[PDB]
Design a protein around this ligand. Structure first.
Ligand code: MG
Ligand code: MG
Ligand code: MG
Ligand code: MG
Ligand code: MG
Ligand code: MG
Ligand code: MG
Ligand code: MG
Ligand code: MG
Ligand code: MG
Ligand code: MG
Ligand code: MG
Ligand code: MG
Ligand code: MG
Ligand code: MG
Ligand code: MG
Ligand code: MG
Ligand code: MG
Ligand code: MG
Ligand code: MG
Ligand code: MG
Ligand code: MG
Ligand code: MG
Ligand code: MG
Ligand code: MG
Ligand code: MG
Lengths: 196, 233, 222, 204, 221, 196, 212, 125, 196, 196
């Protein structure tokens, strides 16, 4: 898999490929690895599918309950909850998660919880097998407070490369855009992104 | 934790006439990927203690949280939290060494090596080490990881014994430590140019310095190294 | 796979004089080929005129010493501040050790003090708590280098009276604390020369009817 | 399983003033089982003495072999081999077997007949010259020998004092080794003569 | 073991500790680890000590012979090539790790060689268990265009790092200095900081102390 | 292992050697002779791994026979034993080692002494007044140490042996089906008619 | 290690060596391998030192409680069975012990039970245990008579250990001797095997091969 | 969960639930035992309030505990069965661990101790 | 393993059980009884791992004794054997399994028949005219298959057994130190006072 | 290590980092991994140092001899010879080599021989541990027929990133420029390239 989240001026965007493999067989070529845990808090999943689905399912539950009781939770709070599950169960999980969300006090925020359950807040984050191929490209091209249209491009290009090189990544590129405005899903197909 | 994932390298430290100094680079590595650059591994506790941590970062972050909460609990029903009954280094250390030995003894270690540096309310320097096995010791110098191998040798040239601690100023101690960081930068493949350094002085108190860089490096000579044996150009 | 043990050793030595006892150890603490400390003491006074050392894996040794002292303190509360006789301390320590028979304390333990007649006494334990009153015993890294020497110079083992051809065994004497201390320092300078884990410093605790007294000597630092 | 610890045994050699001494236990074992008390581990080729601890089949073989070579040497150089040279010989002969070696710990002692110097040396099982004026040790109680020796030895002992020292060093070490003992022999070597003594010791 | 090599402006110097160990036991307190390959090319070894002796003797010999054939002073790069090709052949089973330095007619040289047969060239080098202590010192003090007397001081300090801080090393410091003009200078025990104190006692025995069963005179003749 | 004993009295050497041969679960035979005569006054008994024991003995035998014919002379027992040791010592560093242990009892006509040699499969040789291979020593050495005198007659030797075999029958888990006993003396080699 | 015990007309003899070993290194030449459970009952130490010493001391505590409750000396049957039962509860955990439990009660007479960490418990008249075991058995098997004088029984026990100390590398140091009667056990001293060896050789003729 | 304290002290120092228990005994059929030079005999009465009694199957009043010890009782019959089962088990267990049958004293001491425990534990009468 | 045999003749059942107990290298004892009487007419012999065998037997014994006292009645041999089989069948899936094999010979007073039951450590039970545990069957079944008649007298049974023990002495590598033999008949259980 | 070679209009440039590690210890911080096998044929070494030095030493030998006899060899011929050593000895080599050279007929040529000894001719090539991080960046920034200064920058930036991210890469950046003009060595130090 290849996944990333990027903060920009108006909020934050998450993107991902859409391939799931069991060895070389592509089990699913249209996976949704962008997963909602609250209206405006989403995550990117990598690692085991069972593990990351089951975790995301639980976080969503916790935040539904948080909300019922204390109102809307901070992106940070959501990252705390993921981390607590991942840290406390490191011995039998294989999950690498990027959390991202938007509120008005803080605009976009991105937290990454790699294996082991450490948590790291960042301007952007990349992950999944495909990510190794684009550390160079991303460090070279990310700038803070990009526009939306710039940031969709930065993601589209980063992931087009991750895909090109990583056999465990491919398919369509999905994004989810998080701003004061609301929630926009995007999709880009092979004929667009291969050609870049 | 049964096997460390994101990791911090050497912490180094020494004590000088009036306090202690301690330092550590700002890197979290992921095997040989140098992944996270903005990582503070010096953790100040009150105004008389800095805890420096290496090894697994998820565990470090757990230990941070225990330290926050020790500070919070010591304040409870404690009119003298900011005075005679604040936390000493010696207390924070005993607590950590307890926890480590306990976690080891349940075969589920905190995969770290820690150095607690501070100045005791009675003026005394404190410098002790504990790690994932619960092993502890003190010395005028202390370092984890590579630092044990390269930094101690250099810092011991300054304080070879107890009797030298009074003689060692904070300018000398600090310059020694900075030089060590440069040496480790040269030779530890898991290290970073950027680091943090902290001083705990029984008169100036806690000075914490973020964002240092190794400077005054020598590489020029590298231009005359050609081949590996017999090549001349 | 996590290995919960290590080796910091460490050499310790305990000798029973006839109205006194000594217990000594280097002060150097190591890991692999590194020194961690050139002064990290490993012989402790635990009160009731009892000195203890637990050499081996330093964490397990520290835990054990802690626990024992706490045992002393609770003996007091529980038995009307009674003094803890060295033989009772030994039994008590067998119980602590054997308590961890299936995840042992990885240490060789020695204690020293006076039996109930004011005679010198030394007890030595294995890691799971078998134990023995003993007149002298070395422990840890360089024990194999020292016991033969003591067999010879304390017990006059293999020594005979010139001139009879080994028909009359050389007779034993009582050794002044000063004499015993020479043999201690000589054992340790020998060991330091020939064992890489021994050096730096020598600390000796001496137990007499009049209490506990400490004595320290530089050792070579390579 | 360890070939250097099946049969057991020790050898030690030290120097005095215008003399050298060399000594061994006498035990041939086979693990726990004592087998012989008349397994001398000290041989000589002219005025050069060789102690060999380790796997006994190899002790024997090496002796048979150095007897053979020092024989051929005498026949051609028309003179007995000296210790400095023998040492090199031992060393090169072991390193021929670098990747399949003899499981032994040799020790050389002798006095050079030209120069008059006391000389001693030892080696690992593949033949690195551990060269030392004071003393050398080898065997299953090499640790205990290092300890006795470092305490007992002082330089320039007269022959009759050196005897007393090396004897004590050997006996008290063998007594702390399960796999050595069962008797002991000591050679004292002076330039023109050599005396060999059997020691009284415990038998358990 | 700690061994180092430092170039200076007119040549090169190497140094070494003098301890050698079998496990945690010290078998020799004053072992000389500085080996000659030819008069102006010297060598220091770490690793298996039978392998470093064997392989310096062997190459020393092939060098001498090759020198006699060619009627030319032997070159370091020849020692280097011959060493490495042999180590490589044996796939690392010959446990020799060396710092070789010397002067030949092409100038002064400093190389290291690893057991598997890789080689490094440099201005300063260390190897052995004491390697990292020594390198910390070199990384701290080396400058370009050292005088000879600075290079010795530096190399000597580097080895001291190993002696004190490493348990694998050492006792004394040996040095060899190879200057372009001159005979190579070999300073056995250039430095001896580690003398045993007088013991508290003498352990000389009263004669007749030992029990005996037999005397024989032995036949040398 | 099987049972291999030997004892050197004053005028001869007595070899006692178990009769059983067992292959796993069955005892295949109860009357097997674990000796070969090497020359008229030299006897070798042996035990160890199947096939190897016999092949080795019969090879030693033929070599000594060859020597005798060639030189019209009988090698001393000492020489035979050195020859045998050297062969075993070659075996150990060979591609497939002979796993065989032997005792050599001989009467040395030139010195008019009996001699016993013990040699294990490594080539470890030693001259002894009494010996054994494998576990056989463990039961019997106590008794020999006690009772043995160098001036024993053959009859005394055979009594001392009877006692050793009784101790073995009592304390040893295996039924070795008795022993065959031979005597090597100045007049050669004969077999004791019955060890009842 | 070598340990033995046997029954005769005069009660029980118990005899043991005193050597402790860690690999080749001889840790001690002075280990008490007889545990004095109480003044009427003896145990021997083989296998684990701690395991024997700890549990046999504990056995002493249990036997005492039995006597306070029942107002009657505990039988050796019952004493042995308490220890085997405990030991069996730990089977598989890696206890290591092989011991003889020795006593002499009015109701049973002199009795010996062998107990080990396998669970095994066995009544018999002669046992030896340890790396020196096979050596000891030889001597005992060829001399033991039911009606040995006590003085000769003590000698036989001492000579059987000596046999083992001599051949077995893992046995030696000194011998310890005990005589167990209905009124309890009597210690019969500690004998250095160094001095004892030579004495026996000379006095008895034996150990011919050793040069003395 | 039910640990209500039922056998407790009243202010005169008595424990009514235990005294009330004796009342049950006083109502039970008479039993008697007498000892000889070397027999002991146990005799007990039957009720005659009902006489279509199957006498071969109906529980006897004397019970074997081991082959050498018997026990008889007065009072609640259902309650007697529980003491007897416990005693029979103790006897077999005693053989097992000490390799001897119980003394009579021991077995009595055991049963009494059970009875006593039930006067001092919550939830039981 | 040790030797555990049994045979059911016309009016009784005969159990033959080896006397040796050996611990590693030494034979510790040559007079051990590998039986327990479970009730006056029911006998159980046993073999398998050390400690386990006795502990198991003495536990079965005490249970049957408890039953007899409670009901003043002796369980039939069939019932005892079903009880024992069930206990072994629990052991097998337990944390540490009893490794014990048994034979149960009883005389059933109610039907006036002898009965023999063979049960291995897994709880595999079977009623047979003759049986054995471990390798013992391998040597002896040939002979029993041939000679056995259901109408044999006790004397005939003991002859047939004598022959079996001879075959075991001849062909079996281990010295099991003879057997103890017991007979279970209408009058109970007695031991044949000598056998070889 | 991180290494590359890049063809440009006037010829070809090779670059590399200068770090050699044994685990985490940096054995040598000023390594020369650019190695000459002929005047204008060079290579980049990655994998085992012993293996790549030893191979390079042999290739150089073969081409010295080629030259003596047939004149100057083609860059393709040099790649053939590396390949033949690497393919034929794949079972005991760990060597990943880029070969590059210049002649007038062909200007710059780059061949890469990864593990296994397959050979591949390319416009540019990257390799060593550090290469994984810059597949994206290089695919995105390389164009054919760059100028020398452009190409020195493309390399400098690609390797600055590989170094940044890979712990097994670092030190100075060396290059070697190959054109009609001759042979230029370049060096760039940390204070230059970290700052890009
Ligand atoms: Mg992952
Ligand atoms: Mg957080
Ligand atoms: Mg979960
Ligand atoms: Mg995992
Ligand atoms: Mg760590
Ligand atoms: Mg608190
Ligand atoms: Mg706690
Ligand atoms: Mg420079
Ligand atoms: Mg360990
Ligand atoms: Mg307790
Ligand atoms: Mg110093
Ligand atoms: Mg030859
Ligand atoms: Mg000639
Ligand atoms: Mg070879
Ligand atoms: Mg040397
Ligand atoms: Mg050979
Ligand atoms: Mg071999
Ligand atoms: Mg339990
Ligand atoms: Mg054995
Ligand atoms: Mg029961
Ligand atoms: Mg209740
Ligand atoms: Mg059936
Ligand atoms: Mg069998
Ligand atoms: Mg590679
Ligand atoms: Mg090749
Ligand atoms: Mg690489």
């Amino acid at each position: 898999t290849s996944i990333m989240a990027v903060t920009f001026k108006d909020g934050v965007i998450l993107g991902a490929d859409s391939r799931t493999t069991t060895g070389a067989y592509i089990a699913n070529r249209v996976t949704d690895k962008l997963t909602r845990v609250h209206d405006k808090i989403w995550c990117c999943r990598s690692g085991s599918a069972a593990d990351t689905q089951a975790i995301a399912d639980i976080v969503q539950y916790h935040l539904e309950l948080y909300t019922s009781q204390y109102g809307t939770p901070s992106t940070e709070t959501a990252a705390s909850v993921f981390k607590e599950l991942c840290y406390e169960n490191k011995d039998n999980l294989t999950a690498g998660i990027i959390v991202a969300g938007y509120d008005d006090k803080n605009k976009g925020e991105v937290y990454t919880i790699p294996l082991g359950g450490s948590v790291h807040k960042l301007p952007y984050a990349i992950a999944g097998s495909g990510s190794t191929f684009i550390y160079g490209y991303c460090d070279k091209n990310f700038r803070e407070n990009m526009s939306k249209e710039e940031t969709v491009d930065f993601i589209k290009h980063s992931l087009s490369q991750a895909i090109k090189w990583d056999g465990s990544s491919g398919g369509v590129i999905r994004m989810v855009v998080l701003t004061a405005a609301g929630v926009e899903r995007l999709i880009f197909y092979p004929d667009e992104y291969e050609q870049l | 934790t049964q096997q460390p994932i994101v990791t911090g390298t050497s912490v180094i430290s020494m004590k000088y006439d009036n306090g202690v100094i301690i330092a550590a680079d700002n890197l979290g590595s992921y095997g040989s990927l140098l992944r996270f650059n903005g990582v503070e591994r010096l953790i100040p506790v009150g105004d008389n203690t800095v805890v420096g941590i290496s090894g697994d970062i998820s565990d470090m972050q757990h230990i941070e949280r225990l330290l926050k909460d020790l500070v919070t609990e010591n304040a409870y029903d404690n009119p003298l939290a900011d005075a005679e009954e604040a936390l000493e280094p010696s207390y924070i250390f005993e607590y950590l060494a307890t926890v480590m030995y306990q976690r080891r003894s349940k075969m589920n270690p905190l995969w770290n090596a820690i150095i607690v540096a501070g100045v005791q309310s009675n003026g005394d320097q404190f410098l002790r080490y504990v790690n994932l096995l619960g092993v502890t010791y003190s010395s005028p110098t202390l370092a984890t990881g590579f630092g044990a191998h390269m930094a101690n040798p250099l810092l011991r040239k300054v304080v070879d014994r107890e009797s030298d601690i009074p003689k060692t100023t904070v300018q000398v101690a600090e310059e020694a430590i900075v030089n060590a960081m440069r040496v480790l930068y040269y030779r530890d493949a898991r290290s970073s140019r950027n680091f943090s350094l902290a001083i705990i002085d029984k008169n100036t108190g806690l000075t914490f310095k973020k964002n240092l860089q190794v400077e005054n490096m020598k590489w020029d000579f590298a231009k005359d190294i050609k081949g590996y044996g017999t090549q001349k150009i | 796979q996590f290995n919960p043990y290590g080796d910091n050793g460490g050499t310790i030595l305990g000798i029973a004089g006839e109205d006194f006892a000594v217990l000594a150890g280097d002060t150097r603490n190591i890991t692999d080929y590194s020194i961690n400390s050139r002064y990290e003491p490993k012989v402790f006074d635990c009160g009731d005129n009892i000195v203890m050392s637990a050499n081996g894996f330093a964490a397990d040794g520290d835990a054990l010493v802690k626990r024992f002292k706490n045992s002393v303190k609770w003996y007091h509360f529980d038995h009307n501040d009674k003094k803890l006789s060295i033989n009772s301390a030994a039994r008590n320590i067998q119980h602590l050790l054997y308590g961890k028979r299936f995840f042992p304390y990885y240490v060789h333990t020695i204690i020293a003090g006076l039996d109930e007649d004011g005679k010198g006494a030394v007890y030595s334990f294995d890691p799971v708590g078998s134990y023995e009153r003993e007149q002298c015993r070395a422990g840890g890294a360089a024990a194999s280098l020292i016991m033969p020497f003591l067999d010879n110079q304390v017990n006059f083992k293999n020594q005979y009276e010139p001139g009879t051809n080994g028909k009359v065994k050389k007779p034993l004497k009582y050794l002044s604390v000063e004499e015993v201390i020479k043999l201690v320092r000589d054992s340790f300078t020998s060991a330091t020369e020939r064992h890489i884990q021994v050096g730096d410093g020598l600390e000796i605790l001496i137990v007499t009817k009049d209490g506990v007294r400490k004595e320290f000597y530089e050792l070579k630092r390579d | 399983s360890d070939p250097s610890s099946i049969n057991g045994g020790i050898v030690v050699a030290m120097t005095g003033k215008d003399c050298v001494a060399i000594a061994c236990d006498l035990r041939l074992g086979s693990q726990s089982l004592g087998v012989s008390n008349k397994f001398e581990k000290i041989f000589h080729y002219g005025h050069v003495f060789l102690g060999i601890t380790g796997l006994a089949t190899d002790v024997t073989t090496l002796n048979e072999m150095f007897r053979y070579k020092t024989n051929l040497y005498k026949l051609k150089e028309e003179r007995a081999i000296e210790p400095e040279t023998f040492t090199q010989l031992v060393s090169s002969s072991l390193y021929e077997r670098r990747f399949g070696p003899y499981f032994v710990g040799p020790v050389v002692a002798g006095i050079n007949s030209k120069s008059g110097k006391p000389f001693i040396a030892g080696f690992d099982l593949i033949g690195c010259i551990d060269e030392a004026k004071d003393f050398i040790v080898s065997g299953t109680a090499s640790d205990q020998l290092f300890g006795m020796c470092e305490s007992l030895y002082e330089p320039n002992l007269e022959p009759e004092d050196l005897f007393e020292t090396i004897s004590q060093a050997l006996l008290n070490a063998a007594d702390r080794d399960a796999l050595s003992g069962w008797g002991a022999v000591v050679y004292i070597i002076k330039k023109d003569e050599v005396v060999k003594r059997y020691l009284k010791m415990r038998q358990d | 073991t700690t061994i180092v090599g430092v170039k200076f402006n007119n040549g090169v110097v190497i140094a070494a500790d003098t301890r050698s160990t079998q496990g945690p036991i010290v078998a020799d307190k004053n072992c000389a680890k500085l080996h000659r390959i030819s008069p102006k090319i010297w060598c220091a070894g770490a690793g298996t000590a039978a392998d470093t002796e064997a392989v310096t003797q062997l190459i020393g010999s092939n060098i001498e012979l090759h020198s006699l054939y060619t009627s030319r002073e032997p070159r370091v790069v020849s020692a280097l090539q011959m060493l490495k090709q042999h180590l490589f052949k044996y796939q690392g089973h010959i446990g020799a790790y060396l710092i070789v330095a010397g002067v030949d007619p092409t100038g002064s040289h400093l190389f290291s060689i690893h057991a598997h047969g890789s080689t490094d060239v440099g201005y300063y080098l260390s190897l052995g268990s004491g390697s990292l202590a020594a390198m910390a010192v070199l990384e701290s003090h080396w400058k370009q265009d050292l005088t000879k007397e600075e290079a010795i001081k530096l190399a000597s300090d580097a080895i001291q790092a190993g002696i004190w801080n490493d348990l694998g090393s050492g006792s004394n410091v040996d040095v060899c200095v190879m200057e372009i003009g001159k005979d190579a200078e070999y300073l056995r025990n250039y430095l001896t900081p580690n003398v045993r104190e007088e013991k508290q006692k003498s352990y000389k025995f009263p004669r007749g102390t030992t029990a005996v069963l037999k005397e024989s005179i032995v036949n040398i003749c | 292992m099987d049972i291999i004993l030997g004892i050197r009295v004053q005028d001869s050497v007595i070899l006692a050697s178990s009769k059983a041969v067992t292959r796993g679960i069955s005892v295949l035979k109860d009357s097997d002779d674990k000796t070969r005569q090497l020359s008229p006054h030299t006897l070798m008994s042996f035990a160890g791994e199947a096939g190897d024991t016999v092949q080795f003995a019969e090879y030693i035998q033929a070599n000594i026979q060859l020597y005798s014919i060639r030189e019209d002379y009988e090698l001393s027992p000492q020489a035979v034993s050195s020859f045998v040791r050297q062969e075993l010592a070659k075996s150990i560093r060979s591609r497939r080692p002979y796993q065989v242990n032997v005792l050599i009892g001989g009467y040395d006509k030139k010195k008019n002494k009996p001699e016993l040699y013990q040699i294990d499969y490594l080539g470890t040789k030693v001259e002894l007044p009494y010996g054994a291979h494998g576990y056989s020593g463990f039961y019997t050495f106590s008794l020999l140490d006690h009772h043995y005198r160098p001036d024993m007659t053959t009859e005394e030797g055979l009594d001392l042996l009877k006692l050793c075999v009784q101790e073995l029958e009592k304390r040893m888990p295996m039924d070795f089906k008795g022993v065959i006993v031979k005597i090597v003396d100045k007049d050669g080699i004969r077999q004791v008619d019955d060890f009842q | 290690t070598t340990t033995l015990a046997f029954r005769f007309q005069g009660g029980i003899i118990v005899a043991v060596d005193s050597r402790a070993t860690a690999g080749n290194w001889v840790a001690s030449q002075t280990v008490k391998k007889v545990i004095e459970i109480n003044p009427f009952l003896l145990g021997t130490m083989a296998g684990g030192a701690a395991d024997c010493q700890f549990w046999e001391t504990w056995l002493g505590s249990q036997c005492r409680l039995h006597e306070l409750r029942e107002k009657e000396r505990i039988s050796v049957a019952a004493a042995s069975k308490i220890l085997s039962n405990l030991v069996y509860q730990y089977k598989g955990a890696g206890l290591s012990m092989g011991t003889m439990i020795c006593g002499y009660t009015r109701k049973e007479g002199p009795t010996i039970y062998y107990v080990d960490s396998d669970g095994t418990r066995l009544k018999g008249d002669i046992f030896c245990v340890g790396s020196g075991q096979t050596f000891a058995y030889g001597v005992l098997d060829s001399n033991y008579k039911w009606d040995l004088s006590v003085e000769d029984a003590l000698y036989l026990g001492k000579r059987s250990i000596l046999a083992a100390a001599h051949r077995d590398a893992y046995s030696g140091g000194s011998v310890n001797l005990y005589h167990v009667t209905e009124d309890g056990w009597i210690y019969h001293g500690n004998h250095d095997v160094g001095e004892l060896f030579w004495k026996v050789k000379e006095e008895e003729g034996s150990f011919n091969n050793v040069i003395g | 969960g039910y640990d209500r304290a039922l056998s407790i002290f009243s202010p005169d120092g008595h424990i009514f639930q235990v005294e009330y228990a004796l009342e049950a005994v006083k109502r039970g059929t008479c039993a008697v035992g007498v000892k000889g030079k070397n027999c002991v005999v146990l005799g007990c009465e039957r009720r005659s309030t009902l006489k279509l009694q199957d006498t071969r199957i109906t529980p006897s009043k004397v019970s074997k505990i081991d082959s050498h010890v018997v026990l008889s009782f007065s009072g609640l019959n259902a309650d007697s069965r529980i003491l007897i089962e416990k005693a029979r088990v103790e006897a077999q267990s005693h053989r097992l661990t000490l390799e001897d049958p119980v003394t009579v004293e021991y077995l009595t001491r055991y049963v009494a101790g059970v009875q006593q425990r039930y006067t001092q534990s919550g939830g039981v009468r």
